[PDB]
Amino acid sequence: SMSVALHRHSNALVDILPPDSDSSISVMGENEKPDVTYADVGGLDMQKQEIREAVELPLVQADLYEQIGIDPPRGVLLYGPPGTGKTMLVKAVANSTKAAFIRVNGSEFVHKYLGEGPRMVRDVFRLARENAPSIIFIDEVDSIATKR
Protein backbone atom coordinates (compact mmCIF):
# COMPACT_ATOMS: atom_id res chain seq x y z
CA SER A 1 0.00 0.00 0.00
CA MET A 2 1.74 3.12 -1.40
CA SER A 3 0.87 6.59 -2.71
CA VAL A 4 0.08 6.87 -6.33
CA ALA A 5 -1.04 9.62 -8.69
CA LEU A 6 -4.48 9.68 -10.19
CA HIS A 7 -5.86 11.74 -13.04
CA ARG A 8 -8.65 13.93 -11.77
CA HIS A 9 -11.26 13.58 -14.53
CA SER A 10 -11.35 9.87 -15.02
CA ASN A 11 -9.87 8.05 -12.01
CA ALA A 12 -6.87 6.08 -13.55
CA LEU A 13 -3.45 5.31 -12.20
CA VAL A 14 -1.46 7.52 -14.64
CA ASP A 15 1.94 7.45 -12.79
CA ILE A 16 3.43 6.42 -9.43
CA LEU A 17 5.03 8.27 -6.49
CA PRO A 18 7.98 7.03 -4.30
CA PRO A 19 7.05 5.87 -0.77
CA ASP A 20 8.62 9.05 0.75
CA SER A 21 6.10 11.42 -0.72
CA ASP A 22 2.67 12.08 0.55
CA SER A 23 3.15 12.19 4.32
CA SER A 24 2.36 14.95 6.75
CA ILE A 25 5.09 13.56 8.99
CA SER A 26 8.75 13.37 8.35
CA VAL A 27 11.85 11.91 10.10
CA MET A 28 13.17 14.53 12.58
CA GLY A 29 16.47 14.42 14.22
CA GLU A 30 18.37 16.41 11.52
CA ASN A 31 18.95 19.04 14.19
CA GLU A 32 15.49 18.92 15.84
CA LYS A 33 16.34 16.19 18.32
CA PRO A 34 16.85 17.12 22.02
CA ASP A 35 20.18 17.17 23.61
CA VAL A 36 19.00 14.64 26.36
CA THR A 37 21.41 11.70 26.20
CA TYR A 38 21.65 8.70 28.63
CA ALA A 39 23.92 10.93 30.66
CA ASP A 40 21.27 13.65 31.20
CA VAL A 41 18.77 11.19 32.70
CA GLY A 42 19.72 10.50 36.37
CA GLY A 43 18.83 7.02 37.66
CA LEU A 44 16.17 4.43 36.85
CA ASP A 45 18.90 2.01 35.96
CA MET A 46 16.54 -1.01 35.75
CA GLN A 47 14.27 0.96 33.34
CA LYS A 48 17.31 1.98 31.22
CA GLN A 49 18.68 -1.57 30.79
CA GLU A 50 15.21 -2.95 30.21
CA ILE A 51 14.26 -0.39 27.58
CA ARG A 52 17.69 -0.59 25.73
CA GLU A 53 17.16 -4.37 25.48
CA ALA A 54 13.62 -3.71 24.23
CA VAL A 55 14.38 -1.16 21.52
CA GLU A 56 18.02 -0.70 20.78
CA LEU A 57 19.24 -4.30 21.06
CA PRO A 58 16.98 -5.93 18.46
CA LEU A 59 18.40 -3.65 15.80
CA VAL A 60 22.16 -3.72 16.52
CA GLN A 61 22.20 -7.55 17.14
CA ALA A 62 19.16 -9.28 15.46
CA ASP A 63 21.33 -12.35 15.01
CA LEU A 64 21.41 -13.20 18.80
CA TYR A 65 17.60 -13.35 19.21
CA GLU A 66 17.38 -15.74 16.18
CA GLN A 67 20.20 -17.88 17.62
CA ILE A 68 18.82 -18.37 21.12
CA GLY A 69 15.46 -18.65 19.61
CA ILE A 70 13.56 -16.09 21.68
CA ASP A 71 10.78 -13.87 20.59
CA PRO A 72 12.25 -10.30 20.22
CA PRO A 73 10.16 -7.50 21.99
CA ARG A 74 7.83 -5.91 19.39
CA GLY A 75 5.64 -2.99 20.65
CA VAL A 76 6.65 -1.12 23.77
CA LEU A 77 4.17 0.22 26.24
CA LEU A 78 5.17 2.67 28.90
CA TYR A 79 2.84 2.93 31.93
CA GLY A 80 3.55 4.74 35.22
CA PRO A 81 2.19 7.83 36.91
CA PRO A 82 2.74 11.22 35.42
CA GLY A 83 6.04 12.83 36.22
CA THR A 84 8.41 9.81 36.21
CA GLY A 85 10.37 10.68 33.02
CA LYS A 86 8.75 8.27 30.64
CA THR A 87 9.11 10.43 27.54
CA MET A 88 12.74 11.48 28.61
CA LEU A 89 14.07 7.88 28.68
CA VAL A 90 12.88 7.58 25.00
CA LYS A 91 14.45 10.97 24.21
CA ALA A 92 17.80 9.28 25.12
CA VAL A 93 17.33 6.41 22.59
CA ALA A 94 16.30 8.87 19.88
CA ASN A 95 19.79 10.41 19.94
CA SER A 96 21.71 7.20 20.73
CA THR A 97 20.61 4.60 18.13
CA LYS A 98 21.21 6.75 15.19
CA ALA A 99 18.37 5.23 13.20
CA ALA A 100 15.26 6.84 11.96
CA PHE A 101 12.98 8.25 14.60
CA ILE A 102 9.67 9.62 13.51
CA ARG A 103 7.59 11.88 15.80
CA VAL A 104 3.88 11.79 16.04
CA ASN A 105 1.16 12.41 18.52
CA GLY A 106 -2.32 10.76 18.85
CA SER A 107 -3.96 13.96 17.77
CA GLU A 108 -2.03 13.89 14.50
CA PHE A 109 -4.39 10.96 13.72
CA VAL A 110 -7.70 12.72 14.53
CA HIS A 111 -8.91 15.08 11.84
CA LYS A 112 -11.87 17.27 10.81
CA TYR A 113 -12.66 15.25 7.69
CA LEU A 114 -13.97 11.83 8.14
CA GLY A 115 -11.80 8.77 7.52
CA GLU A 116 -8.72 11.06 7.00
CA GLY A 117 -7.50 9.70 10.44
CA PRO A 118 -7.00 6.13 8.97
CA ARG A 119 -5.21 7.52 5.87
CA MET A 120 -2.47 8.97 8.26
CA VAL A 121 -2.21 5.62 10.12
CA ARG A 122 -1.16 3.97 6.79
CA ASP A 123 1.32 6.86 6.03
CA VAL A 124 3.38 6.65 9.22
CA PHE A 125 3.95 2.83 8.81
CA ARG A 126 4.82 2.99 5.12
CA LEU A 127 7.49 5.79 5.94
CA ALA A 128 8.88 3.75 8.82
CA ARG A 129 9.20 0.60 6.59
CA GLU A 130 11.13 2.59 3.87
CA ASN A 131 13.72 4.15 6.13
CA ALA A 132 13.77 0.93 8.33
CA PRO A 133 14.95 0.08 10.94
CA SER A 134 12.73 2.82 12.45
CA ILE A 135 11.27 3.81 15.78
CA ILE A 136 7.76 5.38 15.74
CA PHE A 137 6.84 7.16 19.02
CA ILE A 138 3.24 8.00 19.70
CA ASP A 139 3.66 10.44 22.59
CA GLU A 140 0.22 10.05 24.27
CA VAL A 141 -1.83 7.28 22.69
CA ASP A 142 -4.59 7.63 25.28
CA SER A 143 -7.31 8.97 22.93
CA ILE A 144 -6.81 6.19 20.31
CA ALA A 145 -6.54 3.29 22.84
CA THR A 146 -9.79 4.35 24.77
CA LYS A 147 -11.59 1.23 26.10
CA ARG A 148 -15.13 2.39 25.64
Partner 1 sequence: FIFSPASGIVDKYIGESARIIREMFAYAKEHEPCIIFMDEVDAIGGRRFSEGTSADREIQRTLMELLTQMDGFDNLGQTKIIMATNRPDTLDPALLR
Ligand X SMILES: Nc1ncnc2c1ncn2[C@@H]1O[C@H](COP(=O)(O)OP(=O)(O)OP(=O)(O)O)[C@@H](O)[C@H]1O
Which residue of 5, 16, 110, 121 would you call a contact of partner 1, by CB under 8 A? 110
User: Does 133 sit behind a cis peptide bond, omega within 30 degrees of 0 on the bond before it?
Assistant: yes
- Min dist CB 137 to partner 1, Å, is 8
How many residues touch ligand X (CB under 6 A)? 11
Q: Is 87 in the site for ligand X (CB under 6 A)?
A: yes
- The candidate with the shortest Cα–Cα distance to 126, out of 21, 44, 51, is 21
What's the CA gap between 45 and 53, in Å, rounded? 12
Q: Is 147 in the site for partner 1 (CB under 8 A)?
A: yes
Burial zone of 29 (CB within 10 Å; 0-12 exposed, 13-18 middle, 19+ buried): middle
- Min dist CB 90 to Mg ion, Å, is 12
Q: Is 145 in the site for Mg ion (CB under 5 A)?
A: no
Q: Which of residues 103-142 bind Mg ion (CB under 5 A)?
A: 140
